[PDB]
Symmetry: C3
């Protein structure tokens, strides 16, 4: 159903140390922009503009891999980072369309997060989940700005 696909949310969970030399707000906007470019084989927009949201949360407490040992042993700082990107999309789409959306967003993420790779060792992971919710309600007023109307 199109209803099930009307609420795509991408959440970024990342180690707080990444805030040092990257504008995460700009990364959010870049990823949102990337989602909005995705078209199916019929030319339909896969992620509707009105329902798209990207949000990012720096974790104040974290443990990554071995805690730095391998890094320090290799003559590096051992100060690791990570970012985990999760897109929750609606049911009903083919694997090919899911993988197209995945590839497009992943390539955008690679480009936007590229500066991080120069600064430290960083794990970067992106997953797409399909929502299996048993109840849905939309009740905001944002949708009103994306309704059709000739002036």
């Amino acid at each position: 159903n199109l209803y099930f696909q009307s609420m795509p949310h991408l959440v970024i969970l990342y180690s707080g140390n990444l805030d040092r030399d990257l504008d995460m707000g700009a990364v959010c906007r870049g990823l949102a922009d990337a989602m909005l470019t995705v078209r199916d084989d019929e030319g339909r927009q896969v992620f509707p503009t009105g329902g798209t949201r990207v949000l990012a949360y720096p974790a104040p407490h974290y443990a990554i891999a071995d805690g730095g040992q391998a890094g320090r042993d290799a003559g590096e700082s051992g100060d690791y980072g990570f970012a985990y990107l999760n897109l929750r999309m609606g049911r009903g789409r083919s694997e090919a369309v899911q993988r197209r959306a995945g590839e497009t967003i992943a390539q955008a993420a690679r480009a936007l997060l590229a500066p991080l790779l120069q600064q430290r060792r960083v794990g970067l992971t992106f997953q797409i989940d399909v929502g299996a919710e048993v109840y849905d309600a939309k009740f905001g007023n944002l949708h009103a700005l994306f309704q059709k109307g000739e002036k």
Copy 2:
């Protein structure tokens, strides 16, 4: 047992904090959850297991980034909140829907003043936990036995 850990998480844009007491919203939603009853006369979400947690996001991008808002003569500074209830397996579709309607109504009432201040997308979903392992190990439940 699967239903003994009812968990409501709110992910929302940090800009909402200016126009909202999010602690009061959490309390209101928790109160609403405690009112949900099945057709066997039982409280659906146990008091001892009920938790509502809310997280303001410091970084976010919403919809077109503001253009549609500006075209309507507004600021285009959008907000959003996403509410997710993770409940246990083994409940009827009727009970799941009753839970959803009760919580959605509470959310509509609690967030009505916010909708007067900003364009805000508001979404609420109920997921049923599909976990392969569960452990409960706190001392909070002891107060409700």
Copy 3:
């Protein structure tokens, strides 16, 4: 029968997220809890003595919530002569598909036992709800694109 090697791709991204009430930050160093849990994860072995959770892919994150409501809001605690200032921590491990029930249970037991040990001082001075769940990832798409893996 455990099918870890057959599902190798899906085994490289185990992450444990902790969502907890912000008041717990007054009671303990949550960073030390994360480290202790990561240490515990790396100890889990399958029936061959192989590491279930790869070191390079192991991630533990903890998020204090600034706004929360727990249980009855303190009444039962105050009635029992306590503060009624409750806490809660919810721990969720997302692991890969294709593992045996026994491997899932071993992972659960090892991590739960570590969590009980690390969070025990909390229980001495506060009423805290503590829940741990393991979910199996059912993602339809993955991408791995960091530079951390090279060290491992």
